Design a binder for this molecule. Structure first.
Ligand SMILES: CCCCCCCCCCCCCCCCCC(=O)OC[C@H](COP(=O)(O)OCCN)OC(=O)CCCCCCCCCCCCCCCCC
Ligand SMILES: CCCCCCCCCCCCCCCCCC(=O)OC[C@H](COP(=O)(O)OCCN)OC(=O)CCCCCCCCCCCCCCCCC
Ligand SMILES: CCCCCCCCCCCCCCCCCC(=O)OC[C@H](COP(=O)(O)OCCN)OC(=O)CCCCCCCCCCCCCCCCC
Ligand SMILES: CCCCCCCCCCCCCCCCCCCC
Ligand SMILES: CCCCCCCCCCCCCC
Lengths: 110, 478, 162, 100, 55
């Protein structure tokens, strides 16, 4: 089919021209305009474990999200049995979320 | 394949342990209650152990392509559940001295027991991989539960790094096997070959990488060096669980994989496993000769005992009673390791800091803890394969299986390793009676567990026929 | 279709080689992200569309975000181990390089003797993967939820501040 | 028209590169990075094998593999943070007090 | 000449061999994680080479 190969060429040209466009604006910004020196121009103008905890929770729940992504595109042909399986999955998810909230894992404020 | 109500009846201990995980986690979310959450965990494990009766009444059947439930799966599920119940029982008096959160321990033990049940029922490379991971990751948490201690943190780091490496090795081997075979079911691994072309190079290489991962998990030489450090650094109930349940479940799924796969009777794999079993027996016995730490000594002992079990694995296709020998040996090894590690756990309870694992701390144990010393000397006699112990019955089964299949190098290795084991086990058991310079019902429950283990070891050492008949009843699908 | 496969494979190999030899951790993670993008391109060239989408969504969009997050939290600057460049000394890496080369040679020799009709690259959709996941692989899905729950509990117990 | 051997060889190359990085790096973060490389390579090998046979099982094993990779990366980075808290140093040779 | 029981020492030789072999094998347990990983990869190489030799 020539339609799919035309769309592949269009997608490739889209990505190439977008990347080259931002590269070209960066190059033009670097090249144009005069430069001046100052004494204090070069002068610039421990994080808690909650940061790692939030990122880790995001990673784990994103993996369970991928499982639900796979389920959601084929719900009709998985039937009510697949609904029961995904309901068990989501219940385990919500129980984990309730556990995380209730023990203060998702409480930034003291 | 779909899931039917009778398949759900065959699913019963897995469903009960999962429901226990959810219930205990929601109870922790309600309120942190050590007694209540420990009680809920042991109630769920006991319920799964009881529901094994309904599983047996249901019969042997395939639940999805992933699992097959039979008497073999029931026996290994029962062994895993017994080890988990003992681990919780030893965990409570140890966790009574823990200043941080104690309720997560039982959650991790329950999830690891779920992985053990999955490995008991596994009929597929997917379920084997998932069961191994489901055992290992809660053990990453449990080994480093007292992560403020440097030994527990170091053991957790070592176990996590090496188990991730072994899991990647096992998954790469599974992928190579799948690339050769085109099916991840156990019975299809080598089925698409004929006319004496079983030794396909990619299939053998994939099975070798799986051997790397599984032999890490079973502490088999040369994937064994983690064992004394992780055994010593872990908390003592965690050491109990890691010595019993993880090893038993992984060896059971290895048993089933080598029974069902047509490439399991390949001569190259048999010779490689013979070399591994020989080296495991000799090395694990030799390294435990001069151990002043009881947990490290039990780690090297575990290496040697898994070598004996692998010797029984090698004669799977040659002889007729290899699976029966493995079942009898694993029951005896579970009871002996439960007693020994439980005495260590009760001597380290409550948690105060460094573990009581020096042999000088167990020197003269009889003069203040006589029952614990009697239990520990019974377990040292059992792990040495001394008669009127179940360990001797297991060793006799291993020797009979090796003699039937004419594995004379392995038989001689078992004899030599038994002599070396005699030296160091007798050293521990007689140091118990030399001269050297609690008060709640959960500690009494742990003492009752180790006493019952000692009584079972002695009684089934004298009279092994009930255990033999039970193991002969628990047979897989041929 | 094979043009993309070979170029993405070469890019992934080169980026991984830059990863395991680099000094700056953020730069090493950036090369790792590049290698994961190339591996996703490999997945898309083989027809495994869901695998490539998850390779960028989850591997190159969640897990390495966590690695980058931890590195940025630790403020890894002029570390003494970082400054030494011990892994760049021949006497440190020449042994493991020979060991990995021997393992690669053995695995490649095993690979070259397998039956190969070629990969047609017919797209196996996310819909078929979802059908398989909630059909024959239902127990895998539920016990994977349990596995990630175990990871969550362990990482909360260990990575707390207190 | 992609040979299965070429995809398997690419996966093996990535696997041994990750193993080399795991062995030669004293810093625990680069050890975890090498572990991520090896598990990603094994998952790639499963995807290649599934694509050769025209089956969803390769991508299902990929999904299980990356679930393991995510949870293991979470645990390993928690342990790395604990090591940095209690040691102020990520040298893995320092965690060696248990031996013999 | 015999008062030291030479046959007893000749039969005690395997005990000193076991002691020496155990002391030599305990050198591998140096406590280093990177060596444990390297030994796992060495064992992988040995297992794979043995399987390809006896295929
Ligand atoms: C049908 C399903 C309905 C949703 C169930 C899950 C919701 C999860 C949302 C959440 O994180 O809830 C946390 C919340 C904490 O409540 P808490 O902090 O005790 O509040 C005291 C004063 N409001 O906890 C709750 O709101 C509790 C929700 C029910 C928990 C048990 C069932 C979990 C599944
Ligand atoms: C405080 C609360 C305490 C609660 C109690 C806790 C402790 C007690 C736990 C009890 C657990 C009972 C488990 C019972 C399993 C067997 C049930 C059964 O009826 O099995 C029969 C069945 C074969 O017989 P049939 O019914 O004819 O088979 C039809 C199916 N084709 O048999 C089979 O199919 C296989 C039979 C063998 C399966 C293994 C046995 C169960 C697990 C044992 C683990 C320990 C073994 C070692 C120790 C033995 C000590 C004697
Ligand atoms: C140019 C020379 C090199 C320059 C330096 C490197 C630049 C990047 C090179 C890699 C990315 C582009 C590779 C070339 C893709 C060209 C399109 C293509 O091959 O399309 C064929 C096929 C279309 O799909 P299908 O329906 O199967 O069609 C088969 C024919 N009917 O396509 C497919 O099936 C899959 C299409 C490719 C996969 C998606 C894109 C992946 C991009 C990954 C980038 C990784 C990071 C790169 C970093 C570079 C700098 C270090
Ligand atoms: C401070 C301690 C550091 C320990 C570093 C350990 C590095 C191990 C390197 C092993 C190199 C092996 C080289 C090949 C050996 C021959 C082939 C395999 C065995 C047959
Ligand atoms: C350390 C253990 C040594 C055991 C030696 C056993 C030797 C067996 C030889 C069998 C020869 C069979 C010829 C057909």
């Amino acid at each position: 089919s020539t339609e799919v190969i035309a769309h592949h060429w269009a997608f490739a040209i889209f990505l190439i021209v977008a990347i080259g466009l931002c590269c070209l604006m960066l190059v033009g910004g670097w090249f144009l305009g005069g430069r001046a020196r100052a004494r204090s121009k070069n002068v610039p103008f421990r994080l808690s474990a909650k940061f790692y905890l939030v990122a880790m929770f995001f990673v784990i729940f994103d993996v369970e999200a991928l499982y639900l992504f796979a389920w959601s595109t084929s719900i009709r042909e998985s039937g009510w049995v697949g609904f029961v399986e995904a309901a068990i999955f989501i219940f385990v998810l919500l129980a984990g979320l309730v556990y995380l909230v209730r023990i203060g894992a998702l409480d930034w404020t003291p | 394949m779909t899931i039917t109500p009778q398949n759900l009846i065959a699913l019963l201990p897995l469903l009960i342990v999962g429901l226990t995980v959810v219930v205990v986690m929601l109870s922790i979310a309600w309120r942190r209650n050590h007694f209540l959450n420990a009680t809920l965990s042991v109630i769920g494990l006991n319920a799964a152990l009881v529901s094994l009766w309904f599983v047996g009444q249901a019969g042997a059947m395939d639940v999805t392509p992933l699992m097959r439930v039979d008497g073999f799966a029931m026996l290994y599920t029962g062994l895993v559940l017994l080890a988990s119940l003992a681990t919780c029982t030893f965990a409570y008096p140890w966790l009574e001295g823990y200043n941080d959160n104690k309720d997560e321990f039982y959650l991790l033990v329950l999830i690891a027991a779920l992985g053990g049940i999955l490995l008991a029922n596994a009929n597929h490379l997917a379920s084997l991989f998932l069961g191994i991971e489901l055992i290992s990751l809660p053990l990453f948490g449990l080994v480093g539960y007292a992560f403020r201690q440097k030994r527990s943190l170091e053991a957790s780091i070592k176990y996590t790094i090496l188990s991730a490496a072994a899991s990647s090795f096992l998954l790469f081997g599974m992928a190579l096997v799948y690339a050769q075979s085109g099916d991840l079911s156990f019975v299809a691994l080598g089925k698409n070959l004929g006319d004496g072309m079983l030794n396909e190079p990619l299939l053998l290489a994939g099975f070798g990488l799986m051997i790397v991962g599984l032999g890490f998990k079973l502490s088999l030489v040369p994937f064994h060096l983690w064992t004394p450090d992780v055994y010593q650094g872990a908390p003592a109930p965690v050491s109990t669980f890691l010595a019993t349940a993880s090893k038993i479940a992984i060896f059971g799924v290895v048993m089933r994989l080598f029974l069902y796969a047509p490439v399991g009777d390949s001569e190259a794999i048999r010779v490689v496993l013979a070399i591994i079993a020989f080296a495991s027996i000799i090395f694990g016995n030799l390294m435990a000769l001069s151990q002043t730490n009881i947990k490290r000594l039990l780690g090297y002992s575990s290496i040697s005992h898994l070598g004996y079990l692998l010797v029984a694995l090698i004669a799977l296709q040659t002889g007729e009673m290899s699976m029966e020998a493995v079942g009898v040996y694993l029951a005896g090894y579970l009871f002996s390791s439960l007693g020994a590690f439980g005495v260590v756990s009760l001597m380290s309870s409550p948690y105060r800091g460094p573990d009581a694992d020096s042999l000088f701390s167990y020197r003269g144990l009889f003069w203040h803890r006589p029952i614990l010393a009697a239990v520990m000397t019974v377990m040292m006699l059992s792990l040495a394969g001394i008669p009127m112990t179940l360990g001797f019955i297991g060793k006799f089964y291993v020797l009979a299986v090796g003699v039937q299949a004419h594995l004379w190098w392995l038989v001689g290795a078992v004899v030599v390793g038994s002599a070396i084991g005699l030296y160091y086990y007798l050293r521990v058991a007689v140091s118990l009676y030399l001269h050297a310079p609690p008060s709640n019902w959960q500690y009494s429950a742990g003492g009752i567990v180790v006493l019952i283990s000692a009584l079972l070891v002695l009684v089934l050492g004298v009279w092994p026929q009930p255990l033999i008949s039970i193991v002969r009843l628990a047979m897989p699908l041929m | 279709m094979e043009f993309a496969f070979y170029i993405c494979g070469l890019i992934a190999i080169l980026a991984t080689l830059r990863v395991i030899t680099h000094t700056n951790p953020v730069h090493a993670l950036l090369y790792l992200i590049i290698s994961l993008l190339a591996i996703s391109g490999v997945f898309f060239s083989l027809g495994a569309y869901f695998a490539g989408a998850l390779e960028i969504i989850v591997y190159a969009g969640a897990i390495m975000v966590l690695f980058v997050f931890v590195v940025m939290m630790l403020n890894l600057g002029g570390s003494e181990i970082e400054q030494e460049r011990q892994w760049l000394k021949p006497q440190v890496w020449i042994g493991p390089a020979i060991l990995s080369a021997i393992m690669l040679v053995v695995i490649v020799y095993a690979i070259l003797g397998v039956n190969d009709q070629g990969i047609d690259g017919t797209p196996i959709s996310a819909k078929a993967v979802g059908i398989t996941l909630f059909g024959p692989y239902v127990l895998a899905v539920e016990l994977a939820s349990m596995l990630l729950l175990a990871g969550l509990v362990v990482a909360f117990h260990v990575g707390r501040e207190e | 028209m992609i040979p299965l051997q070429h995809g398997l060889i690419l996966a093996a190359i990535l696997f041994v590169l990750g193993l080399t990085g795991l062995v030669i790096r004293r810093n625990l973060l680069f050890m975890l990075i090498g572990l991520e490389i090896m598990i990603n390579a094994s998952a790639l090998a499963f995807v290649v094998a599934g694509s050769y046979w025209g089956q969803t099982d390769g991508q299902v094993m990929y999904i299980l593999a990356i679930s393991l990779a995510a949870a293991e990366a979470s645990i390993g980075l928690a342990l790395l943070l604990q090591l940095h808290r209690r040691r102020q140093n990520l040298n893995i040779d320092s965690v060696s007090e248990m031996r013999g | 000449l015999l008062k030291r029981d030479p046959l007893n020492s000749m039969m005690n030789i395997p005990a000193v061999l076991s002691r020496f072999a155990g002391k030599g094998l305990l050198l591998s347990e140096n406590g280093y994680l990177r060596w444990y990983v390297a030994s796992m990869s060495i064992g992988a190489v040995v297992v794979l080479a043995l399987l390809m030799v006896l295929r």
